[PDB]
Amino acid sequence: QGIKKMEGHYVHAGNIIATQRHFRWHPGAHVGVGKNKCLYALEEGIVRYTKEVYVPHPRNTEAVDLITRLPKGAVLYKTFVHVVPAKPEGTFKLVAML
């Protein structure tokens, strides 16, 4: 296991980015994931890593208990994998002059 593609490498959408058991790799912008806890590309562009504080969903109650167990001055931080889209979504081209 591990990161399949290094950050900054151009990768198409759906390509495997980072696979891990116990989530060492966290999701950033445009980073899909399924039941296998692996990170995959959701868009074409350049991969980057960012150390940003992770706040769990309210559905996770054990994570809520752990965050409560963390101090008020304690900050978690986590390495998320953002996918900056290189190409644009689309462009308007002049069809015809009726």
Binding site: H12, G28, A29, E44, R48, T50, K51, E52, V53, V55, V64, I67, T68, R69, L70, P71, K72, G73, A74, V75, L76, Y77, F80, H82, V84, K87, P88, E89, G90, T91, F92, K93, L94, V95, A96, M97, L98
Partner: protein
Amino acid sequence: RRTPPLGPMPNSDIDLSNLERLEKYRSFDRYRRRAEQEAQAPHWWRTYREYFGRTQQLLERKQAIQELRANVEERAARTASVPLDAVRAEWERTCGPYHKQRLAEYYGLYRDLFHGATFVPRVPLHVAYAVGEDDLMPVYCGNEVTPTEAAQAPEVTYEAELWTLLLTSLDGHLLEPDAEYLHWLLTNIPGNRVAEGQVTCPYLPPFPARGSGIHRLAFLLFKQDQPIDFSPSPCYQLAQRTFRTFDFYKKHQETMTPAGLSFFQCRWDDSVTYIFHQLLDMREPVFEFVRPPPYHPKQKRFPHRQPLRYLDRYRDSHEPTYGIY
């Protein structure tokens, strides 16, 4: 080797000898507030933003709040009406400038038309588009109006007493980008009378092309200290109407500062095509808004374990055949 953090590591100082003596995030809102306070900082380990990003008035307000509490008492709370008209009027009177500057920055009007230099509009200006007799369509900062309803010139209100009103579409239609299509040009308006000032460019209707997204048209009035000359008569030429507001503000609006702005969206409609055919005397263009195509994978000699879709990627389509009839 071993890379540690370049700046101060997180959760370093708050540890101390007595970890149990920490106050701890008993409330989840407290931890969220601390995390948001940390996220407001730019930090040294990079982030997503690294890659992507009076006393008398106070006493009067206190007396008003005390009177409101006495009128409520409690009983009205146990559901106050709080009419939004007076609140909106007071907000436009007191704190409308910061929100107006925020809206102008969000629309990119100052960055495009004025090439930057955003300012808080002191004069509160709202437009009224004439649609029949009653009522008039209200146009605030960002209020959308279709080209069909915007065939005629609209009225404007600012509650002020020289002035110079102009209208420019910052979308850069037809011609090259980084330009705005001028629509109207009122200059040297005496007092609130906009008709007192001369009209250099007569008011033209909006002409947004089909399928070109949304267009941004802004009408702006600036505070004028002294009246100045201008210059283009009623013309349908697109070359004369093409002008940037930054260049006009830089080397011509020396003794002039902005006072008020109103933004609006513009889309293709029947009146846009009518103006294109009759007034512009040209064929109306239509835009496609087309996305990029698939890259398509690399073609090899054999499909290997893949299904039948491997050998049919990089041509087109549906009925092609064999050697020759």
